[PDB]
Amino acid sequence: KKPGVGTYATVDKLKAFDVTDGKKDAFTIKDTVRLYNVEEGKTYAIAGQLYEQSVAGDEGSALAKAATTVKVTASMAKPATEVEKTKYGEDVKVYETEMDLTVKREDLTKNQVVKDDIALVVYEQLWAEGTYEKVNDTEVTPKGKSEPVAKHNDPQSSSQSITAEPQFGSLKLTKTVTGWEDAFAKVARPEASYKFTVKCVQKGSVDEFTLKEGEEKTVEGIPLGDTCTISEDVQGAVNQAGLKDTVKFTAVNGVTVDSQVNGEAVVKIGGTTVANVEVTAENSFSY
């Protein structure tokens, strides 16, 4: 029997949190530390670090760090999990304590649009009594070449994983028509089909579709703060109506829509601000 260490990471009792929550400036990862086959009455040092998964273990890349000393006692004992017993034996003695790892929301988002879930992971080390020169509240200083007696530096650990989950916005587009003239039209008004392409730059999306007059289409899952472009096939509209088409874009809820070329709009979907945006493209036909 040799000492071991394990961890279970949570945020507000859960395995994920909303990283695009503007009301939060930081998040606290509860790092529940499980000490295996340690000696009652000895004083160990423990350290934890929080990393984004792709750089997990890279010194300099830590989002948060914590360190402390723990004098192991019987009152800390907790029942072993089946996973713990499988690894360490059915008689493994488990002692539990905890530390907090607090990360600033801006160190996750970089104050930029968040496209995808950010995978996080907690690493932990256990240091035996006398093996560390000192401990501050972030790091254990070794005695020269000394090392922890156990580590849990496991980047694929589900137990130590946390997901920083972004929320998403959406864009609804509705087509309207004014100025139709049967003398010039080449199709029946209710059969006219108006072609659009909606692109969202941070999402990396291209959605092509048609709307008849009065129809709508929604593009979902747009990163908050994304820039979205809407492009109509204006010549296709002109060909069907037999008239010039001035496309007039509007949006509800005070959202601005910019149009620098006829049939082209740019709109922001949320902030880095309204998240479910609704735009109307009016095909204003005239001779």
Numbering used by the authors: 1 to 272, 278 to 292
Please give the exact wording used by the authors of the publication that reports this structure.
An adhesin from Mobiluncus mulieris, a bacterium associated with persistence in bacterial vaginosis, contains 51 repeat Ig-like domains. Each domain displays cross-linking including intramolecular ester, isopeptide, disulfide and thioester bonds. This giant 7651-residue protein, by far the largest in the bacterial proteome, is presumably retained because of its critical pathogenic role. The intramolecular cross-links, whether isopeptide or ester bonds, stabilize the individual Ig-like domains and provide a covalently linked ‘spine’ the entire length of the protein stretching from the surface of the bacterium to the adhesion domain.
Crystal structures of the mixed ester–isopeptide construct 46E–47I were solved in two different space groups. The molecules of the two space groups differ across 287 aligned Cα coordinates by a root-mean-square difference (r.m.s.d.) of 1.78 Å. Each pair of domains aligns more closely (Cα of residues 1–168, 0.72 Å r.m.s.d.; Cα of residues 169–292, 0.50 Å r.m.s.d.), suggesting that the flexible interdomain linker affords slightly different relative domain orientations. An unambiguous intramolecular ester-bond cross-link is seen to connect Thr6674 on the first β-strand of the domain fold to Gln6827 on the last β-strand. A short 2–3-amino-acid linker precedes the isopeptide-containing 47I domain. As predicted, an isopeptide bond links the first and last β-strands of this domain, joining Lys6842 to Asn6955. At the N-terminal end of the isopeptide domain 47I, the disulfide bond between Cys6895 and Cys6887 links two adjacent strands within the same β-sheet. The disulfide linkage between Cys6887 and Cys6895 identified by mass spectrometry in the 47I domain is not fully formed in the crystal structures, possibly as a result of radiation damage, and is consequently modelled at partial occupancy.
